Design an enzyme around this catalytic site. Structure first.
Site, mmCIF file in Angstrom:
data_model
loop_
_atom_site.group_PDB
_atom_site.id
_atom_site.type_symbol
_atom_site.label_atom_id
_atom_site.label_comp_id
_atom_site.label_asym_id
_atom_site.label_seq_id
_atom_site.Cartn_x
_atom_site.Cartn_y
_atom_site.Cartn_z
ATOM 1 N N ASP A 35 0.823 -1.200 0.000
ATOM 2 C CA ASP A 35 0.000 0.000 0.000
ATOM 3 C C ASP A 35 0.867 1.266 0.000
ATOM 4 O O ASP A 35 1.338 1.701 1.063
ATOM 5 C CB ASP A 35 -0.928 -0.026 1.220
ATOM 6 N N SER A 199 -0.551 15.573 -12.154
ATOM 7 C CA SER A 199 -0.807 15.193 -13.526
ATOM 8 C C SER A 199 -1.042 16.440 -14.374
ATOM 9 O O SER A 199 -1.603 17.417 -13.901
ATOM 10 C CB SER A 199 -2.022 14.267 -13.589
#
Length: 330
Positions: A35, A199
């Protein structure tokens, strides 16, 4: 040193991925959820309340000759999905795919919430976010990667998640045969303890690319792709019959519909998520309504590039003095 381990989807939907981890002496092998959105290595154990264990493999520290109680230490975590767990701490030898850390904090669960109990395939979590998020008190503990870092050939690990198929976590090296083209690296902020990056934009199917900054985290421990409501609306508007269902808790669509791809920007580069990756099947057995793999982050408070996005790429988690993220197509 290096390590390399295969990671395997727990079910036919890729709801999560499990990776075998050796703990203790002799080795006890548990299947953990790697994770990159958290920083605790915790396991089902001989100490876990009996009623809360239902098919998981447990760690038994008393059977490990290298286990040592971390005296006074406790831990308690609550995840973005509402699940939680807590307990005490041992240090022990932990190996992943041939890479060994001695004195790793292994957080033994005394209590786990229902969703963990109910998932027989996940024996625990192995956190790979930054150690500043680790919950052990009074003395914060380091992640497996942090402990291994100095010994690694290169201070990196990579995630290569499969679509409906196994993939690979590598530690300490970049497998140049595992991706196409070049790796585009992008800046990381560690201020919230996550692998957080920006992004450069998105496209829906064959649509034109929209240049816009999307701050989010690279999180292998989250199944879906969670993005701003505007972006998500633009995607599902291109799917005939799709709608946001408050009763279901997100976007659903008829399984007879064709899903467009979703492209996200990494600097000037582009990662394409095929439409099939965005299908998470019937909301209930027999239903013609299918759950979508791109959902709104509104009210999470952060955008999450979860498995839906990451499995479309070869992802470098670069733990250099100044951390960065790398993405390649594959």
């Amino acid at each position: 040193s290096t390590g390399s381990a295969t990671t395997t989807p727990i079910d036919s939907l890729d709801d999560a991925y499990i990776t075998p981890v050796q703990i203790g002496t002799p080795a006890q092998t548990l299947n953990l959820d790697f994770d990159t959105g958290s920083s605790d290595l915790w396991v089902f154990s001989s100490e876990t309340t009996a009623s809360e264990v239902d098919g998981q493999t447990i760690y038994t520290p008393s059977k490990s000759t290298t286990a040592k109680l971390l005296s006074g230490a406790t831990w308690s975590i609550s995840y973005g999905d509402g699940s939680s767990s807590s307990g005490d701490v041992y240090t022990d030898t932990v190996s992943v795919g041939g890479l060994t850390v001695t004195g790793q904090a292994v957080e033994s669960a005394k209590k786990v919430s229902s969703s963990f109990t109910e998932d027989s395939t996940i024996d625990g979590l192995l956190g790979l976010a930054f150690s500043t998020l680790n919950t052990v008190s009074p003395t914060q503990q380091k992640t497996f990667f942090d402990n291994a870092k100095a010994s690694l050939d290169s201070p990196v690990f990579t995630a290569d998640l499969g679509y409906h198929a196994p993939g690979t976590y590598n530690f300490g090296f970049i497998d140049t045969t595992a991706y196409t083209g070049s790796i585009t690296y992008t800046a990381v902020s560690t201020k919230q303890g996550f692998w957080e990056w920006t992004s450069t934009g998105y496209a829906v199917g064959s649509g034109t690319f929209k240049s816009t900054s999307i701050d989010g985290i690279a999180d292998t421990g989250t199944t879906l792709l969670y993005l701003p409501a505007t972006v998500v609306s633009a995607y599902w508007a291109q799917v005939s019959g799709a709608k946001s269902s408050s009763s279901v808790g997100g976007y659903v669509f008829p399984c007879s519909a064709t899903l467009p791809s979703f492209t996200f920007g990494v600097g000037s580069a582009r990662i394409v998520i095929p439409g099939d990756y965005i299908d998470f099947g019937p909301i209930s057995t027999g239903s013609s309504s299918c759950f979508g793999g791109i959902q709104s982050s509104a009210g999470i408070g952060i955008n999450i590039f979860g498995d839906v996005a990451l499995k479309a790429a070869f992802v470098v988690f670069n733990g250099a003095t100044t951390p960065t993220l790398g993405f390649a197509s594959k």
